[model samples]
Target: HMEAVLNELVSVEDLLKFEKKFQSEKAAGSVSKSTQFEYAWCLVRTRYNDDIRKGIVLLEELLPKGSKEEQRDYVFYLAVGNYRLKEYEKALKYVRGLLQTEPQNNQAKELERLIDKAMKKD
Candidate 1:
C-alpha cells in the first residue's frame, strides 16, 4: 500500500523538517496556504495516529477557506486522514462528497474502492 510504503519512507525527522520550515514561515508572517497544506499532508502520512488526527484538524481548518479546487484538495486529504485512522465510514463520506461534485475524480474513486475493500476484510 502507498500509505505503508510512505510510513516507512517518512521518518519523524522528515516531518519535523516541514514543521520547522512552516514555523519559520509563520514567524515571518509569510506562511502560504500551500505550505500549511504540505505540512498537513506530511502529518497524515506519518506512522503515528496522533499526527494523522492532527493532520485532519489542519485540513478541516483549510476546508472553510481557499479556492474551490483547493477545497477539494483539502477534502481529499481529509478523506485520506480518516482512512488511515480506520474511520472508513467518515472516509467514504468525504470521498463521496467529492464524487458527488465531480464524478470524474479518479483519485477519489480509487479511495472509495479502497474503503470498500477495507470494509470487506476479515
Candidate 2:
C-alpha cells in the first residue's frame, strides 16, 4: 500500500511538498481529486497535538471514506484534539467510535478512561 511503503520515513514538509505536486498534477488533469483530499487527511497527523479544529472538520467528513486504519487515525486524533480543546463530550464521542470496532485499542481505551475521569470531576 502507498502509506505502508513510506511509513514514517519522510518529513512533514516533504509530504506537504509531495501533496502540493499531487494537487498541481490533479489540476493539470493527471491525478484524482480524492488523492489530494486523502493527502490532506494524512497531513493532519503531522499537526501532532497542535490546533486541529479545522483538521477535525475535514477528517470527520472523510471518516466514512478512508480505509479503516486511516479512519482510525482520524477518530483517534479527533479524540485528542477535542480533549485538548476541553470538549470532553465530543472527545468521548470520537473515542467511543474508536472503541466500537477495536475494544482492545489501548489508545482509545486510555483516552476514554481519561475522559470519563474528567467528566466526573469538579
Candidate 3:
C-alpha cells in the first residue's frame, strides 16, 4: 500500500491527490502516523516545491504534540525532511535530539555528519 502511494508522487498534482486520499483515510482512523510519515516522505522526495515544504511543516506540527514514541519517530523523519529542504540548523537540532534519545542509531549518526557538512556549507 505504501509503495503504491509513494511510487506515484512524480508531480505536484500527484502529491495533492495523494494528500487528499491520505487525509480521507486518516480521518476515518484507517491510517497510522507511521503511514502519514511515509506519505510525507513521498511528498518530500517527489520534487522541490512549496507543497513539499508545506508537507514538512505539517509533519513538524504533528510531532511535538504526539506521544513519546511518535515524537521519537517524528524526530527521525523531521531531521530528514529538514535536510532535504536544506534547513541545516533545524536538521541538526532534530538529528541531535534523535542521537540523545538513541545514541547508537547509526542512521542518525550519519545524518549528524551530513548535517554538519550542510551547516558548514551555509
Candidate 4:
C-alpha cells in the first residue's frame, strides 16, 4: 500500500500550481520553509526525472537551515525521489541515515525495504 502510493505520480496541473505559488513567493522574498518544502515534496512526486532532481536539490537547500524534524522530512523525500529514479543505492543511503537517527522509524524502514527490493532488479 505504501509503495503503491509512493509510486503514484502527482498531476502536472497541481504541480504547476505549486510552482506558480512558490515562484510568486520567491519573487516577493518571503517564501516560508514549510511552503518551499511542500513545493519540493510535490515536485518529487512528479513524473519527470528532471523535476525529481530539482526536488532533490530544493530539499538539500533546506537541510542547512532545517529543524531536526524538518530535516527528517527532507531526507525522506530525497530518498523517495532517488527511488523513483531507480537509483536504489543512493536512496538506500538516505534511508540508512534516517534509520541511524530514528532507530524506530517505520517510514524509513519501509523505504529501506523497498530500496532493497528494487536493488535486485536494477
The TM-score measured for candidate 4 stands at 0.87
Alpha-carbon shift of residue 121 in model 1 (angstroms): 0.4
What are the candidates' C-alpha RMSDs?
A: 2.6, 7.0, 5.3, 3.2
Model 2 agreement with the true structure over 1-122: per-residue lDDT tens digits: 77954664564655567568766876888554365445545555454544246556656666777787777877887787687667889899889988988888998899888888887893
Off by over 4 Å in 2: 1-50, 120-122
The TM-score values for the models, in the order shown, are 0.87, 0.56, 0.69, 0.87
Q: Which structure among the candidates has the greatest lDDT?
A: 1
Candidate 3 residue pairs in backbone clash:
none
Question: Where's the lowest-lDDT run of ten residues in candidate 2?
Answer: 43-52
Model 4, which residues run further than 4 Å from truth?
1-10
Backbone clashes under 3 angstroms, per model: 0, 0, 0, 0
Ranking by lDDT: 1, 4, 3, 2
**1 or 2: which has the higher TM-score?**
1
Candidate 3 lDDT by residue in tens digits, 1-122: 88866565445566676678778877887666655665676676666667567668767777866898777777887778778888888888888989998888899899889888867786
lDDT of each: 0.90, 0.70, 0.75, 0.87
Clashing pairs in 1: none
Any idea what lDDT model 3 has?
0.75
Candidate 1 lDDT over 77-98, as tens digits, reads 9999999999998999999999
Local lDDT at 113 for model 3: 92
